[PDB]
Amino acid sequence: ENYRDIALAFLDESADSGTINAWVNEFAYQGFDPKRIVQLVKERGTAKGRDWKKDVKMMIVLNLVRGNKPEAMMKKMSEKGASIVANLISVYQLKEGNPGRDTITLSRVSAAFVPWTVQALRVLSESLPVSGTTMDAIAGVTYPRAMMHPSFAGIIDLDLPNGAGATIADAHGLFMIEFSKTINPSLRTKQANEVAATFEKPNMAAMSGRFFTREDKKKLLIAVGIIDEDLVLASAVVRSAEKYRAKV
Amino acid sequence: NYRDIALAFLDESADSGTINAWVNEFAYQGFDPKRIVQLVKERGTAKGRDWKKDVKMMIVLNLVRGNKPEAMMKKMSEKGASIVANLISVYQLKEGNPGRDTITLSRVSAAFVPWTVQALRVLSESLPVSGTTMDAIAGVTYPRAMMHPSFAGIIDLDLPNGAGATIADAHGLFMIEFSKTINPSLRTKQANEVAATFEKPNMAAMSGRFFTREDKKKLLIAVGIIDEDLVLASAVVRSAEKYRAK
Amino acid sequence: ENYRDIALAFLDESADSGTINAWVNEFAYQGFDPKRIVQLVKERGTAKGRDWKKDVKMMIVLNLVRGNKPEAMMKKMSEKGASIVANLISVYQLKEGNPGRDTITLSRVSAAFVPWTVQALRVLSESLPVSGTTMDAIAGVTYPRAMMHPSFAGIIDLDLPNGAGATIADAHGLFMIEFSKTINPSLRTKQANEVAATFEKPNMAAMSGRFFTREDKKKLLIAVGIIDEDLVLASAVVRSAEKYRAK
Amino acid sequence: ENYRDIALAFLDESADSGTINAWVNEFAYQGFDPKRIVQLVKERGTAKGRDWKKDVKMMIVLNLVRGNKPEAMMKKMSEKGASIVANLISVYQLKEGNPGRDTITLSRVSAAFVPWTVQALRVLSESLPVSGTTMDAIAGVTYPRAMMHPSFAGIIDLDLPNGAGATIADAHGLFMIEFSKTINPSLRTKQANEVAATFEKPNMAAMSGRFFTREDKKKLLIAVGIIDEDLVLASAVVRSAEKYRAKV
Amino acid sequence: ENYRDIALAFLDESADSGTINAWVNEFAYQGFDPKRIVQLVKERGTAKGRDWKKDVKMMIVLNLVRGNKPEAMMKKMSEKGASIVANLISVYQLKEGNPGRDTITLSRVSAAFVPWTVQALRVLSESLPVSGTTMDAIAGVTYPRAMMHPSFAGIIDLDLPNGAGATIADAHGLFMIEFSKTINPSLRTKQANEVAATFEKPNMAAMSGRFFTREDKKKLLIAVGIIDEDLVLASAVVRSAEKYRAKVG
Amino acid sequence: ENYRDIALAFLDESADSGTINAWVNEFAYQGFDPKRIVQLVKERGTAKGRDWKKDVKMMIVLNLVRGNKPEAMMKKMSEKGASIVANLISVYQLKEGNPGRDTITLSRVSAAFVPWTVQALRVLSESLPVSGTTMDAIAGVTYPRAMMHPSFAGIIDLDLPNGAGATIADAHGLFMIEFSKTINPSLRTKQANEVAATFEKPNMAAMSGRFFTREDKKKLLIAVGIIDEDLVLASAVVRSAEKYRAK
């Protein structure tokens, strides 16, 4: 009954933006820890008699083409390929979807080891669920092969000058709205507004990743062709972003 | 023959006050703010713990992740998911709106609103409905203070000139979008049906006997909704007239 | 030996509207018996050692504010109040909705003991699901507080001169179309035509009630302010009815 | 193995139109015998002290307002009325739905004693499940009160000149598609095509009724206002039929 | 490998249209065996014993008017007629729908003993679910009474010269699209395209029937009035077919 | 600890272009091996009776008309035909659907032995689930009988000049969207967009088949009438493709 004084005295408490924003980044939506993924791949890989660095490449390529269901893709695959996939499931304990944070999935391998994933996309652009030529028709120009995977969202700096990261994020969104339509045909009927909201939460988690620094992401964006040394966005990036803005 | 038993009920003591004493007793009340503060105080100090900081953390956790403690942990940083699990243990956190003595993250923000109303000034862009989003929907920069259902617990409806009704409508401009986000099934519905989905528990917070009419006056002034001369901010009135257009 | 002679002769058979209408009202839709409700409240109240006349008042007030779901309203109510509600559920065996005719619900208590319900509305007009000031905005004038509940339909005489009962019925319909929109938000999207048909069957049952006589209903309408002794409708009633006819 | 020759030999087998039509008269879809209903009402009514001619009226009025479930309607009815209903159930052995042909239901009483049922509808038009004013809104004009019951189908002559009987049948169908929507809300979602066929089998049985002759039905249609002495359809009938044809 | 050379050599492999159609009809969808139906009616009928030739007539007439649900039609029928129906269910073990091939249904009796079914339709044209006058309004002329039942599909030769069998099949389809709309009210809402596909599989089975020969069907089509001795289609048949083609394609 | 550096060290990593595509062709979606099907038909066929080359023909005809459920189609088939079907199930161990890759199904026989399947369609066009005349109505012209089966997708070269393979693929898609609607009536309600995505994965597997060479598929397309010797698409093919693009 006299709890009025207790609640009213919370009007003057520390509402500092330092610890509060420190808590939101702590309570931030995080599907998995990239540091944990690399560790478990390294540990379970070297303790098993394996060249994990090669297996990482194979798991990424496997994920970029077949998806994230290791047990399901084996039933419809060449026995020559289905054999080594069964191996990768055994040694690295592969699971499907997004379960626990210490469980290794094919999508998290591509997200953790993105600097190689961003290079593999440059090659097998026509073997993706959404082909390269398809994105070249949707966009006004030839859509950047680097952005043709959700793992690309883990190397984009939103704190770039002039808000360049927001432009790249929108440019990357042009692919994601089609990638979501393909991997989930139920979203095809929905317009771009509803589709964009189906991934804007886990994708935003990769953008605000504390795994790569602001300078590390700068090197990654330059070396792949999204941006140059003078931090100037490519013509393909800006034109792909303005087409995404025309869908919101 | 049962007419006299029933028809003679015309002269019965329609005592004004005791009838309303039953009405104020039967009023729709999701929870008791006095009970929430007590249980946070008791279970917090009996556990050897700094509850005042935990209140801050529980409010921040609620303002960003929602009201499902067990569900938000599965998709959160282990550094953060650890202390959330702590808050669930000591204060016995539950989800939704169950019993009145069960502490939920939404009730902590509602009970300890004077701090919740200050936190919104900071993490405006981390909310389910971002600050800039409300700045586009409203004609001006929508008051950050109103960007949570807990704001309804500090608004005086008995304000002169029906100013409380204006603030209530201004707060409704956010709630119709907050309901659309936390529940995408209401997105298809127009503003009329969405406004009726919260107008019952929200009205309960407005007619709260927890804060007095004078206590709510101090809270509205210190946060920027109204001034000392009881004059509504330009952002409040313009946000209300846009809600009346729905 | 009974081919056409019996059935074909029913063209010459009488079908006057005097005896027929008495059978329709006899064969009428009846949600519950007001005589049965009062009896069960009286019996179960005095046999349990409590003042039922006070409980009747509390059950009516409880119904006028919270509705007709006793088990649900307790979960969101003050423990001081949720305690005495649990009591009312125990002794009078309260149920929800409109089940059997001998099952006592909060809505039937207000309907049976309407002469007190019609007085309580004069007080708690702003605590109703549809507030008094709300009806004052919808109607051209201050809408009669007496009509602010479906229980009011049980005291209106349709056999009033000049069809005055039809006017009061329409005036009462102005509230019911909004009361149905509030207690059931799914009807909010529907226009007044579809909403009016959602209650025009149980409400018509209360209008043609054989519980109160034509003279008893006359006394009730006068003592509450709907009509005067000269059977002249109040200005608030007629103006509220003409707004309902426009829907 | 020579069974092929046996079936082919049915070309010369006899099939005169007299005996064949004699078999269809045994196989025609008949829910009940109107002659049997009238007899049982007369017998069981006169074998008791009951005035059956008055009870027939009450059973028809009871059916036109409450339906065809005597045991169920009593539980939600005034005790003054529920008392005499219980009586009608006792003496005439009333049942519900469409069971045996020798079992008397409230719907069959209205169908057998239709010349009185067709007159009662003129009075209690606003007490029906489908009100009179409702049919006045659906149809372009004031829909004939006589047609506001499935029992009306038992007095319409399909062998009328210029196919006038087909017009009245369609005009009566405008009410039945709404009557079926009300007594069975599950058919409300269905469009008029599916609803019209839910009754087109028992209704067609009443149309081809050998109970009333072609001349007896002529007298009934004239005396109630559906058609005049020169066999000219009323303006309300034809306009209600053309609105029903706009639903097929 | 050498299996590519092996598989590619199936281009030079023989595939005459004669043996293929024999495999199509051999691997064909078959609801029941007409030979089996006649046998079981003969055996179970004479062992009672029954005048089965008369019972066949009654079962056909019963099917042409009430349908294919013996247990259901009895509940709404005159006791004088419902009695002999109950008998037919007992002796010939009548079932409903299309279950096993050795189970006798009222629809299969009319299909097996079609030469009598095709004659009965000439009489009870106005007692059918789809009346004769109804088909006379839908079609430009008086629609052939012979075609007013799905059993008619069992006597039409598709191998007739000038593709005349395809014309009769389309002419018979004009009735089937309305017969399906009546016996199944859910198909009324659907257009003729979707309705025509609901029966085009069991109906095609009756057309390619090895029960009646190409010549036996010729005698049947002539004796009932669909075609003449010079294999010239009736004016009513062709005009009913061109009206069916204007809904289909 | 410094697992960040490890991830960044994959920037200057040996990312090939040959071996990667070698992994893609290894991980490519493959329902079955056409080489394996022909082998098992040859082995299990000669090891019992038997004229397998005739059985291949019968199994193809059986698949083109009844589908891919050997055990189910027997229950509704002539005993004369159901007998030899039971035989084919015995000797070649026939199963249904798409299980293992070493299990022989009726759909895989038609896909493996497509050069004969592509000739049978020219005859039994009106016995198919989707009749020939039906496709003649959907398309502006007489739709190529050769394309009237999913097995046709195994002989189309996507690496054809002027992107002709993409045109034939779209032309073949005009039939598949109707074939999927018939064999699975649940897809009938769905529009062409959703239906086209239900088969675009196993069908694309047949298009990129390493079984037939680019030159072998050329001979097959010419000899059946889809394309001529000058690699010019038939008028029926291009017009059927532009109608598929309209969906």
Author numbering:
A (entry chain B), D (entry chain E): 4 to 251
B (entry chain A): 5 to 250
C (entry chain F), F (entry chain C): 4 to 250
E (entry chain D): 4 to 252
Copied sentences from the primary study:
Toscana virus is an enveloped negative-strand ribonucleic acid (RNA) virus that belongs to the genus phlebovirus in the Bunyaviridae family. The genome of phleboviruses, like other bunyaviruses, is tightly packed with N into ribonucleoprotein complexes (RNPs). As in the RVFV N structure, each N monomer consisted of a core domain comprised of two α-helical lobes (the upper and the lower lobe), and an amino-terminal α-helical arm which was divided by a short linker, hinge II, in α1 and α2.
Using an unfolding/refolding protocol, nucleic acid-free N was obtained, as judged from the A260/A280 ratio of 0.6. The apo structure contained 12 molecules of N in the asymmetric unit, which were organized in two hexameric rings. In the hexameric rings of the apo structure, an almost perfect six-fold symmetry between the six monomers was observed. Oligomerization was driven by the amino-terminal arm, which bound into a hydrophobic groove of the neighboring monomer at the outside of the hexamer (pockets I and II in Figure 1E and F). In the absence of RNA, Tyr32, Lys204 and Lys79 localize closely together in the RNA-binding tunnel. Furthermore, it can be envisaged that the proposed inter-subunit shift is energetically not favoured over the planar architecture, since we do not observe it in the apo N hexamer.
